[PDB]
Amino acid sequence: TTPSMEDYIEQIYMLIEEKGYARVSDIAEALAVHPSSVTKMVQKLDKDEYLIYGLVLTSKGKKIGKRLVYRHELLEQFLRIIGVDEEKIYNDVEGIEHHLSWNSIDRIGDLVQYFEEDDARKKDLKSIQKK
Amino acid sequence: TTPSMEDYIEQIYMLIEEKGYARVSDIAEALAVHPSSVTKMVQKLDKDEYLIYGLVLTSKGKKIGKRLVYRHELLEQFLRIIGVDEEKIYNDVEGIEHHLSWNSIDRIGDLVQYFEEDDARKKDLKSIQKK
Numbered sequence: 156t157t158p159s160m161e162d163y164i165e166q167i168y169m170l171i172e173e174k175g176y177a178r179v180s181d182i183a184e185a186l187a188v189h190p191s192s193v194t195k196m197v198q199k200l201d202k203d204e205y206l207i208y209g210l211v212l213t214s215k216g217k218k219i220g221k222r223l224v225y226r227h228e229l230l231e232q233f234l235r236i237i238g239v240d241e242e243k244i245y246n247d248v249e250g251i252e253h254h255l256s257w258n259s260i261d262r263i264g265d266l267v268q269y270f271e272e273d274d275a276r277k278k279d280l281k282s283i284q285k286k
Numbered sequence: 287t288t289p290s291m292e293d294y295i296e297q298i299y300m301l302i303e304e305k306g307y308a309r310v311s312d313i314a315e316a317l318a319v320h321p322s323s324v325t326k327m328v329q330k331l332d333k334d335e336y337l338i339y340g341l342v343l344t345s346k347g348k349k350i351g352k353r354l355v356y357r358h359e360l361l362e363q364f365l366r367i368i369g370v371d372e373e374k375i376y377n378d379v380e381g382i383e384h385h386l387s388w389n390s391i392d393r394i395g396d397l398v399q400y401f402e403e404d405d406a407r408k409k410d411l412k413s414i415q416k417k
């Protein structure tokens with residue numbers, strides 16, 4: 156499971172969740188790539204049993220897509236919470252998401268929980284940004 | 287400019303700081319790449335005025351290199367402060383360091399400063415890791 160395959164599964168999962176199905180055309184446009192590039196990855200994903208090529212994810216692909224979508228959202232929340240400009244959050248998440256261990260993700264999970272459970276901590280963090 | 291050029295500059299900068307000079311052989315071995323690849327990059331770097339081909343960094347290459355080493359250091363401190371297993375930290379930094387805007391880097395800098403001025407915060411976060 157390379158970062159590119161992950162990106163595709165993340166995208167396919169999202170499309171299925173949003174529209175109810177994933178068309179190579181929708182994937183190609185969503186990733187801003189050529190449909191051939193997409194056709195090649197889909198076949199690779201099929202071979203690896205993440206999906207069945209009417210694009211359907213196997214239980215294996217759903218678990219992964221779900222984890223990948225969860226990781227993306229958590230990473231945006233993380234950067235949002237620490238005060239990163241909203242417009243820059245998405246691009247940063249896209250480039251780092253597929254390069255972090257689960258250990259890092261889980262610890263970032265606890266960090267987000269840390270600030271979300273007590274707003275006083277968010278206020279203190281903001282203070283430091285001013286100093 | 288480029289995530290790869292950035293990786294070389296960071297490496298060249300480190301070698302100059304450690305040894306006082308940077309050898310193609312030391313670069314090729316540090317990046318785990320063939321000396322030919324390196325030779326091609328250094329020439330690209332020279333054209334762009336980051337250095338002069340032993341090889342010397344120009345004021346532009348030094349400033350960049352210094353920043354990159356700072357970012358690497360901070361990211362490792364970041365992940366360490368939040369509890370990531372040490373063995374996992376280096377590889378995570380290496381893969382996300384060249385994909386974060388300065389905005390994110392600076393906000394992480396404040397986050398690190400936040401946990402540094404009060405151990406109670408570190409302990410509180412550590413608790414959540416138990417929950």
Ligand SMILES: [Mn+2]
Nearest residue numbers: 162165249252
């Ligand atoms: Mn992605």
Ligand SMILES: [Mn+2]
Nearest residue numbers: 227248249252
């Ligand atoms: Mn994403």
Ligand SMILES: [Mn+2]
Nearest residue numbers: 293296380383
């Ligand atoms: Mn690097």
Ligand SMILES: [Mn+2]
Nearest residue numbers: 296358380383
């Ligand atoms: Mn580095």
